[PDB]
Design an enzyme around this catalytic site. Structure first.
Site, PDB file in Angstrom:
ATOM      1  N   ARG A 169      -0.889 -38.603  73.280  1.00 34.01           N
ATOM      2  CA  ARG A 169      -1.280 -39.225  72.238  1.00 34.01           C
ATOM      3  C   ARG A 169      -1.138 -40.877  72.402  1.00 34.01           C
ATOM      4  O   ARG A 169      -1.148 -41.373  73.436  1.00 34.01           O
ATOM      5  CB  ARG A 169      -0.143 -38.896  71.243  1.00 34.01           C
ATOM      6  CG  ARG A 169      -0.400 -37.585  70.721  1.00 34.01           C
ATOM      7  CD  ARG A 169       0.722 -36.860  69.456  1.00 34.01           C
ATOM      8  NE  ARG A 169       0.216 -35.646  69.097  1.00 34.01           N
ATOM      9  CZ  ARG A 169       1.124 -34.838  68.320  1.00 34.01           C
ATOM     10  NH1 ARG A 169       1.940 -35.420  67.588  1.00 34.01           N
ATOM     11  NH2 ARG A 169       0.472 -33.597  67.992  1.00 34.01           N
ATOM     12  N   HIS A 208     -11.809 -30.606  77.934  1.00 34.75           N
ATOM     13  CA  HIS A 208     -10.995 -29.496  77.837  1.00 34.75           C
ATOM     14  C   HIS A 208     -11.179 -28.644  76.423  1.00 34.75           C
ATOM     15  O   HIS A 208     -11.689 -29.248  75.547  1.00 34.75           O
ATOM     16  CB  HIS A 208      -9.597 -29.948  78.186  1.00 34.75           C
ATOM     17  CG  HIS A 208      -9.333 -30.410  79.385  1.00 34.75           C
ATOM     18  ND1 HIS A 208      -9.301 -29.644  80.594  1.00 34.75           N
ATOM     19  CD2 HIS A 208      -9.381 -31.813  79.924  1.00 34.75           C
ATOM     20  CE1 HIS A 208      -9.053 -30.292  81.824  1.00 34.75           C
ATOM     21  NE2 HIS A 208      -9.274 -31.666  81.294  1.00 34.75           N
ATOM     22  N   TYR A 221     -21.174 -32.687  56.700  1.00 35.01           N
ATOM     23  CA  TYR A 221     -21.876 -33.915  56.510  1.00 35.01           C
ATOM     24  C   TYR A 221     -21.712 -34.833  57.477  1.00 35.01           C
ATOM     25  O   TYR A 221     -21.992 -35.969  57.317  1.00 35.01           O
ATOM     26  CB  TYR A 221     -21.561 -34.469  55.023  1.00 35.01           C
ATOM     27  CG  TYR A 221     -21.944 -33.436  53.777  1.00 35.01           C
ATOM     28  CD1 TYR A 221     -22.912 -32.638  54.072  1.00 35.01           C
ATOM     29  CD2 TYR A 221     -21.329 -33.650  52.723  1.00 35.01           C
ATOM     30  CE1 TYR A 221     -23.254 -31.463  53.158  1.00 35.01           C
ATOM     31  CE2 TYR A 221     -21.447 -32.785  51.592  1.00 35.01           C
ATOM     32  CZ  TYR A 221     -22.617 -31.928  51.761  1.00 35.01           C
ATOM     33  OH  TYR A 221     -22.678 -31.034  50.728  1.00 35.01           O
TER      34      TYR A 221
END
Lengths: 481, 476, 128
Positions: free
Chosen positions: A25, A71, A115
């Site tokens: 992260r 990955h 979309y």
């Protein structure tokens, strides 16, 4: 269940666990501050060549393409960051040019995956161009074959000025944003003046900026956080009292500080009505907001509306206690930086960038120089070499005689041997000589740039000014004491 | 007016007849099947690679031409997969096609096929400008109206026409017998019909029958008209309890077992011989076991003659034997098929010879320029150093020696690897080889019999590769 | 789809060719099991095609025909159906009736737009 007895492999897997959750992260990186997934997005968009020059494209297909080139990681944070770098209002600067359904700023994250049609912005052309540029190591994935770059090099501390979101992993940190123009100013002042002080660049640097446009009061937290990056500061909304044709007063806000909903605060206003802890308030209205944001509270007479504004910025969430935490990471290990040291690491990164780019161009010119050396040496003693090829037999005999007569290498000798009649006009012979000396001049120029380091600084300042010309950055917030 | 209506009548009748009636004498190959084989050759994918399962081929066929149904094109595919009807062989396939049974393979694209072995050498020499071409109605790709041949498939596979004016029966024959007939007419322009009786003992089938007559065969190969006997095979064996058991393997042609057996059941069940409740007609996946057992106190041969009167175990198979060439139909005999195929192969071989002379003399002109370049080189080099333009260099070479523009530019196409002396001898050697081959082709063109010898060569090629015997056992 | 109403604009949108049929073919023909009509075979002579269209109905008598320019010309002008049913059933139960007494049953030849008809001498000639 577990039944794992070896504590050593538990500790090793636990260290890999901790560091991998770190790496995964968002992190305060050296060169982009980004998530690695951001780097994945950018490198995939670049090496597919999907320009904003060309028209729009369905982007979930591109998402699956990058996911399959990389990955088998989960779709969630992928599509999240896809939206986030397309959100114009949240990040201060433009990266992804979407086309669909998002929700403006009021708690409705529209996630129309069907979309998902988009392009990018024109700032990646300033961000990275490492096609030929020997810059960054690569890691290999599908049975360890295909490249993935380690970092995102640039010529630009733009992502310093963007802002970061890396909190819940271990300890918390972020990057609050500025704007760019006075950033360019203070950076160039450090460039030409390596021994400046902090507060004299605080004379160059205004407060930390916000895209909505925030009222800033106080500078002691500015003094603390430009140094040590810790502390909360106070922020207020542009809020005015306006008189009607009747003499009634109106609280009119324009915007809010960072991470504020219209609607949750509006519900909190309706609470404050039914909580019966604030008086005077009559109308809680909001219309025409798409030509420009207009939320109006309207209050009866005999109510002391400015005291009510004081009660707003005491108790309501309109007041913002915005805190900073910039706890850096430089090559894996966690650190913490001043505003100088960030730009210092930026400087030495640009040093290595331009040096390695110059060395790649150097080897280009040296290889083509050996080519044209072989061409001109072939032009020297032409008819002797005609007798050589009329005499000899093999590759070995030809290379032996050419090395004995002209002291050249094997590839040079064969590139001599690959000369046809249609490159034997004296026109093209002297064009070879001309472009040869042109490349000699370029080699000498790059050696002169190798002689002195400050040409790098000058060219960087030049193209900073080019970017500031194409990307004029007016202010939107407001600082007071 | 009415003359223009007659013109429309004539031209449209020609359109329908040349469309879906009998093909040319020159090929014996109907233009639907012609374009099937042409587009399958232009698939390019070898029969060595495993044969495909697609209607994409037929989609390109219908893109080549719009019929009144591409289901009819698939019918043409399947009827050329009918080995039991049309002989060996035009389909390398895998899917459902049935037998002479009443089989309906509705799985259209689900069958597999590609090019066949006989088609490979059967349709070579497209790259030799042998056959003319016409443009389609789509104005984008071309197609040939006729084909090159390596045998008269006229005789190999027969004809079952329709009566637009009248239909046509043409019987199949044998491979090597046709080869021997070709050799016979080649060696002698003075053959007889008994000579045809020798090299063709009789027309044959992929299934087999019996043809007892002789003069009907005689009038067939002379007049082109006549009917023959097609007879089922009959084997009289002994039941362990004393019944004259009849074993049948062969049949008349285009005769399903099913409805014949049903009418036999009817004729039994219409107050006639009813004790023949013995019809063991099965296990026909190893061959044909069509076995009945005649009841006691009854001879087999009377029931045999009665089923011959039923016209299904013995049938008067007629022959119309017509053809199309030069826009006209024609009543057929031999020395017509024969001489037509001969002069067609003459056309093919001689035009191939002309094209090979074209390639060979073009390359000879090239190697002329090559050797004249490799004579004297360094003076040309130094005069090129006195120039700055390839047009100037061309004018310099025209001043130096006699060349072509192509020759001059090919001599300009010389890197330094071209500056040796061993390759001079190699170009001279292949130059003399090519001159020898050109003189050989010229002397062959001044030789009528050499063409026939090349025909013998290709006949011996396909004869070493393949042969076939008379599976159709015919007693007369 | 797109057709053009009655004023010389035959709209021929082949892409837009989306349709169904009417419910009158259920009266027209139901020959599934019905041994009625011979068949002709097409693709290497395999698949059926019926010779005629049998029915229980002279509807297509009453429809009208367009066959002109081939050799000589002919057509079928239309009627309506109800008095057609009437006169037909009168011939059914009465095999020896006269023409003009069925002209008492049969009005003029009809038209879908609704036409003003004058005169009956041509009616006398053309019914015959």
């Amino acid at each position: 269940l577990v039944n794992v007895n070896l504590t050593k492999e538990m500790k090793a897997s636990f260290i890999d666990y901790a560091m991998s959750v770190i790496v995964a992260r968002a992190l305060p990186d050296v060169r982009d501050g980004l998530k690695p997934v951001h780097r994945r997005i950018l490198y995939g968009m670049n090496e597919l060549g999907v320009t904003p020059d060309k028209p729009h494209k369905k982007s979930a297909r591109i998402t699956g393409d990058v996911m399959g080139k990389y990955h088998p990681h989960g779709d969630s944070s992928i599509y999240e960051a896809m939206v986030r770098m397309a959100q114009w209002w949240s990040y201060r600067y433009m990266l992804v040019d979407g086309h669909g359904n998002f929700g403006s700023m009021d708690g409705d994250s529209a996630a129309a995956q069907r979309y998902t049609e988009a392009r990018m912005s024109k700032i990646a052309l300033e961000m990275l161009r490492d096609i030929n540029k020997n810059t960054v190591d690569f890691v290999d994935n599908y049975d360890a074959n295909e490249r993935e770059p380690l970092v995102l090099p640039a010529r630009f501390p733009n992502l310093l000025v963007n802002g970061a979101t890396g909190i819940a992993v271990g300890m918390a940190t972020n990057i609050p944003p500025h704007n760019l123009g006075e950033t360019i100013d203070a950076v160039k002042l450090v460039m030409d003046n390596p021994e400046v002080t902090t507060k004299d660049l605080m004379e160059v640097l205004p407060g930390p900026d916000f895209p909505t446009g925030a009222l800033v009061m106080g500078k002691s937290g500015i003094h603390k956080a430009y140094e040590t990056g810790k502390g909360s500061i106070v922020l207020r909304s542009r809020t005015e009292i306006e008189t009607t044709k009747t003499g009634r007063e109106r609280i009119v806000v324009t915007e809010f500080p960072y991470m504020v909903n219209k609607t949750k605060v509006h519900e909190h206003i309706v609470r404050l009505v039914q909580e019966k802890r604030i008086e005077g308030i009559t109308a809680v209205r909001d219309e025409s907001n798409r030509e420009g944001v207009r939320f109006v509270i309207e209050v009866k007479r005999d109510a002391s509306a400015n005291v009510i504004l004081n009660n707003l910025f005491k108790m309501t969430q309109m007041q913002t206690n915005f805190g900073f935490n910039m706890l850096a990471i430089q090559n894996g290990i966690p650190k913490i930086l001043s505003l100088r040291q960030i730009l210092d690491a930026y400087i030495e990164h640009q040093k290595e960038v331009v040096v390695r780019r110059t060395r790649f161009d150097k080897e280009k010119a040296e290889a083509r120089a050996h080519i044209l050396e072989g061409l001109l040496i072939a032009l020297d003693h032409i008819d002797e070499v005609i007798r050589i090829i009329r005499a000899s037999e093999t590759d070995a005999e030809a290379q032996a005689e050419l090395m004995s007569k002209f002291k050249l290498s094997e590839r040079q000798s064969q590139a001599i041997l690959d000369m046809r009649l249609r490159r034997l006009t004296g026109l093209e012979r002297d064009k070879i000589q001309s472009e040869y000396d042109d490349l000699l001049a370029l080699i000498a120029d790059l050696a002169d740039i190798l002689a002195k380091p400050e040409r790098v600084s000058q060219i960087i300042k030049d193209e900073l000014d080019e970017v500031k010309r194409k990307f004029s950055d007016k202010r939107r917030t407001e600082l007071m004491v």
